[PDB]
Symmetry: C5
Subunit: 312 residues, 5 copies
């Protein structure tokens, strides 16, 4: 409970490291994630410390009592992290080693503009309660920086884990102490999205395109409208895992293009039937033969252009 | 814990400002929203203060102990805000500067009568626990009024942030102290709603309108009824993000008009087939040619009238 | 903490009033509702009071300390109400005025037998912890009875607010103290339910009824079965806001009648086709012409009878 | 806080009774239920009691302080029950009467093998913290056993309420004290399930069976496959209230039988068309006439056998 | 509160056992599970113990006060377990026996690659707060190891319950104490999944395969596309209980194969109609007769290969 000793007149640089233990519940649509980890705090001090004179009499005279505990808080947590003290340790320089285990919810924005093939970057910020009898500074230990015990996140490939200090810039003077930025880069495992979402949609569209080899108006109308119904049903099927998104997405563009193709093919069928009724068979045949080679080429080209737009 | 000093006999005007840090979870259908922010309290006092005689001996003799803390509460919160003290500061006039970080849920009504192109106004009210040894008054600092650190809300354009005092009017005398009103104006980003909701519905309706170029009764019946089924399915698809609304809405009117158009087109098809069977071909042809130009014009006109009704 | 003074040997009649501030979250299917309100407690006493001798020396010698606080509890709350003391006041008769703000969940049964045009009655019960050194009695102040600050509940018309005392009848002697009954009458705003639920169902049924003007068996079968499919889809669409109900409802009866009508019209179509095949054209024609005028009249009559059954 | 007096060397038999006040939220699929009730504890004692010598001087010298409170806990509650002390009372034999109000969640397994016509049996178990200075025994008072104040549970008929003591059999010696078993028998009100679930399914199946009076292959195929689609849609409609069940159910069997009937009728239609094409009209006609009387009889017989299997 | 006595200089081996009482709420898609159980802690000690000299004077001098309580924590729990002390007991060697009841949520990963016929293995880890005045060691009692009181988990067959110690390997020295691993093996009861999911899908596919016995293009197109729609609807019906899975699954493969078969059968129907129109009847007939025997054989073979891939 004693104040930090200002004998050097130099800011108390504090070195800290967060050690991940288990990361689950990446609720995409909600933009949060559960985190269980080990928070390692270890500060340096000179006065009210002890030089090596105890030696074997007292190899490490540990203090159970809470002394000079640097009050650090997350800035992106609705509710303060869980507290569970594990162990304490002192160095022959008087520097205390503290360990704790906690469970938190962190609010980090997610960007789904390339939903199936996207890479996120989860953020955690650290702030320190700055004292008046001395100046405090947060630093990150390069070792102890953070590791995951070879944990795995379901459907994500963890890529790095990096700490970096940065000014608060919170427009408050006593709130200008530099904050810690814990960056966790992840990449989605996209393989199963192909056979689970992409291929059946193309299958339904290809099934509807068969009407360009048929002359029967009734059969063509049934094909195209029933395939539109199947498309809408399949969209209802796959929206359950798609997060709620008020901006343009790769997959949303693809869906819009598919609706537009359905409209254009109903138009083609109607024009062919009208021309046949008004007795222009050569013209009907030419339009349908043209459509045969024209629909898939234009679908391919539009997809290439969409992909070069969304993926650089 | 001491009482405010009544040496001026003049109400203790208290100046306060809420600083936004992160606003998320605008649950539309629920009419609440999560808020994380910094609450800055700073009152003035004359007695039990200190004039500048300490000077360099004590540039700012800060009081860790809680003195003259004005108990302020939100009036529109189910549960009291989180408490996390950050820092304290004193002025050479004895005026204390207090900062805190909190996380709250605020109950604000939302009006979705122009759902895709609407603008909301989130409200936060402040009340003060009024003491008996002195009179207290809440004021808002024009500076420190509130800022968002350039935060962004997903799918919303933040427009202003304004504080304004107003009488409680809570029909209770000791509850007549003027309250603070924090107004946050937002505007929805409507672009993606167009290709996500509006266009495919029109596409299905236009697809159903093709039956006015066909004579086959069976094909016409399949077209119109299958397109009605597709409309109902698409409504099931898009209701998931539409909030539960017990009043008339722009989009609800549009949906009702589309159901009515489907009914009228089944009627047209039936009348054409009946006239053809009863051998009035000229009349059948005239009705269908009329319908060709009559359905889209009436749809356009009704939409113009609906929009001039809902948007002034 | 002192016991009530038994100097009159007469029960301590306590007068109380609940003042509504904000009522939201009327979760119909769950039969609860959030309530934020002001609870005003004010008891009378003679001993350990003070007559008007202080006068201007002490116009109102208020007691911050908690004295003779009547412990009152709700009986229909899963978890005790929130506590937030606001202010205290004393009368020159020694009678204390207490105010508080709270947030509660109240369990009240809802009766949806006339779902679109129903009127509910939310209930709140008050009980008092009865002491042994004196007798306590709960009364309600006619003024201060309760008001809503002109609050509005979304989709409901608030009608009255009435307090009434009634015996507990809880089969326990020390639990026989009369309880307070706070009754809040509300009426649903039914207008938007018409164009949102009722009309499209009738539209689909009328669309299916067109088969009585057609001779083609294939077209008739498509009409009637596709309209049945559309009915089921629309039911899936509108069940999302309908509360889970294990008893007969007006709307449930209507839905059952519509299923039955669909069955009877498939039967009519089949009988007409069978008679035509077996070469009884006059009889087929007579049955279909009869059905033309017979289906809507019987629908109208059944609806009148259903409504006189459910609405007196 | 004093220990029970061992003057008789005989176990302290404790008599208790739970009085129901409000039972709601029977979440079927979750196998829990909310309970609000009054718990009445009343133990007997001889030493540190008082014989009738006070008389009118002290008709009942009540102890506000907590003395000899038997610590009883539920064994089937995730979280301990709510605590709200109401009143206390002493008998001229020194036996204390205690009352409390609580709100709990009880984990009781539900058996849905006869879902529409099933009867459940909710269970509540009581355990007592057994002391070392004396032996304690839990008994149930036949009067005070428990009543419901004529409460009603929505969609359930409450049948009895019975207490019964039974050995723990928890394989722990200090955990061998006999436990109390509170049994609440309920029966479902099945009437509305008939017109809400059962009849429309039969209506769709009967509608599909009409194809045995038609010769047109196209119309027969449309009838049967569209009715299959309607069946699947109606199943989606009614699964919302059906609890998640990993075992065989009466209704699940019925649904499986209906799918099988649909398969067999597509087979019948295909065989009739094949025989007609291969020019065996007598045989086609004989098969279809046979199917006419064979499908409903076999449906009836299978239903009788299913019901005698599931309902003894 | 006293420190463990270091008179042997030998680590304090502590023996513990978890006794299951009720296991429910195996939320598959969430990878957690509720657990209610009895935790039995019993350590050995020599100093500050008592040899058998009390005898009948004090058969077991029990200590109500908390002495030498080994602080043990779960490592895979978001929030610490519930605490409810039941009883305490001492041995004539001074070894204390402790019992407690708790309610926890345990985070264990689930592997659904063989979803209908899979076997899980729920894990619980134990850690011990290691003290500085002595060395502590966690051991598991072979008896008292854990039992379930013949509890049953709905839809799962409990198979074993085994304890095993293992090094932490948490990369922290003071965190290197060996941890306990409680392994609970379960197997799913798959019977009802057959008639509930597997058979109706095959029924719809077999229904679509009938088009290889028909020549009518319109009827064939209706069969195949309506059966595709029914497949999508049935998938919507059965996804509600299937957990969200970002990897390949047996059932997901089966669904993909069924979509592919639907595509190939639309292709077959189109090619037959094209050849008939272009007047190659022998070739059309040969292709359709080939398809008759070729579709089911290839379905069978692909299923065998899929099953030998997913089940060794
Ligand atoms: C005789 C034949 C008749 C043909 C009739 C054609 C139909 C008429 C209507 C056509 C509508 C065409 C699009 C209308 C505007 C919709 C905009 C749109 O599709 O954009 C979505 C998307 C791209 O979004 P970005 O702008 O890249 O998103 C990032 C920036 N926020 O575009 C597409 O989906 C293109 C599809 C082709
Ligand atoms: C908007 C409402 C859309 C309703 C349906 C519009 C298309 C109906 C089909 C028109 C048709 O068959 O026209 C045949 C017609 C016959 O020509 P003759 O004078 O005989 O030479 O041919 C054409 O017009 C050629 C095709 C071009 C017209 C295509 C129209 C597409 C409309 C898109 C509107 C987008 C909004
Ligand atoms: C031979 C041809 C036969 C034609 C038969 C026509 C169908 C017969 C039935 C027609 C029903 C017409 C509407 C009936 C009442 C429905 C009211 C309605 O639609 O109102 C919704 C809405 C407007 O609501 P407001 O009043 O502006 O909302 C703000 C105030 N609360 O109106 C529309 O949707 C108009 C659509 C045209
Ligand atoms: C309500 C129930 C609605 C069922 C369907 C109603 C419409 C069926 C079609 C009527 C039809 O074909 O009539 C043809 C008939 C033949 O006339 P002749 O005597 O031969 O000269 O022509 C007409 O009646 C002209 C069209 C006007 C009738 C339209 C009726 C619309 C009814 C809307 C009801 C809204 C509620
Ligand atoms: C040749 C033509 C063949 C015709 C065949 C007809 C179909 C045969 C089956 C008919 C079933 C008729 C109803 C069977 C019992 C269903 C009961 C029922 O519908 O009741 C619901 C409801 C009324 O409920 P109440 O009793 O008023 O509710 C309050 C009391 N709890 O009734 C209706 O929906 C009536 C609809 C007409
Ligand atoms: C129950 C299973 C229902 C399957 C379908 C039943 C109805 C099929 C249609 C019967 C049909 O077309 O009968 C024609 C038949 C031909 O008569 P002839 O002997 O030629 O003079 O006419 C009739 O039978 C007249 C109509 C009355 C029969 C209606 C039967 C309705 C059955 C409802 C069952 C409810 C359960
Ligand atoms: C030429 C005509 C071709 C006919 C082809 C017929 C289809 C071939 C496949 C038929 C599958 C028959 C059932 C296969 C096994 C499914 C088991 C099954 O249905 O059981 C469910 C259920 C009964 O479950 P219990 O065993 O009583 O449940 C309590 C014990 N746990 O049975 C039924 O649904 C019977 C339906 C007839
Ligand atoms: C003239 C006839 C025209 C025929 C046209 C055929 C359609 C053309 C497209 C065919 C697509 C074929 C598959 C494409 C890649 C999809 C991959 C795929 O299906 O894999 C899923 C699955 C197996 O996954 P594993 O790799 O075993 O999973 C464990 C390892 N993570 O494979 C299948 O479903 C096989 C189905 C046959
Ligand atoms: C991709 C877009 C798919 C659209 C539909 C493709 C198939 C249409 C049917 C083709 C057809 O009928 O061809 C008949 C044609 C007539 O031959 P002649 O020259 O008369 O001898 O026969 C054939 O081509 C034999 C069948 C082989 C073609 C099958 C094509 C399958 C395409 C799969 C694409 C997968 C992506």
């Amino acid at each position: 409970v004693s104040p930090p000793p200002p004998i050097a007149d130099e800011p108390l640089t504090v070195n800290t490291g967060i050690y991940l233990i288990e990361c689950y519940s990446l609720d995409d649509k909600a933009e949060t994630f559960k985190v269980n980890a080990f928070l390692s705090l270890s500060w340096k001090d000179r006065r009210l410390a002890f030089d090596p004179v105890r030696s074997g009499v007292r190899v490490k005279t540990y203090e159970p009592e809470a002394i000079w505990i640097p009050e650090i808080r997350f800035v992106n947590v609705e509710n303060a992290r869980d507290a569970d003290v594990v162990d304490i340790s002192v160095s022959p320089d008087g520097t205390v080693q503290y360990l704790e285990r906690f469970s938190a919810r962190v609010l980090s924005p997610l960007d789904f503009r390339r939903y199936p093939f996207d890479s996120q970057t989860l953020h955690i910020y650290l702030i320190v309660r700055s004292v008046d009898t001395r100046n405090i500074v947060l630093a990150v230990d390069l070792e102890k920086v953070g590791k995951n015990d070879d944990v795995f996140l379901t459907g994500w490939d963890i890529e790095s884990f990096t700490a970096v200090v940065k000014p608060a810039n919170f427009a408050l003077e006593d709130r200008l102490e530099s904050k810690l930025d814990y960056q966790l880069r992840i990449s989605r495992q996209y393989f199963s999205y192909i056979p689970n979402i992409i291929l059946p949609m193309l299958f339904i569209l290809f099934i509807s395109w068969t009407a360009f080899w048929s002359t029967s108006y009734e059969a063509n109308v049934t094909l195209v409208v029933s395939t539109l119904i199947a498309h809408i049903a399949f969209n209802i099927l796959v929206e359950t895992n798609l997060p709620k998104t008020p901006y343009m997405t790769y997959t949303g563009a693809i869906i819009f293009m598919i609706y537009l193709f359905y409209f254009v093919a109903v138009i083609e069928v109607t024009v062919q039937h009208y021309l046949k009724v008004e007795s222009q068979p050569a013209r009907a045949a030419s339009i349908t033969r043209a459509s045969r080679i024209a629909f898939p080429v234009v679908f391919l080209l539009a997809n290439i252009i969409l992909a070069f737009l969304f993926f650089g």
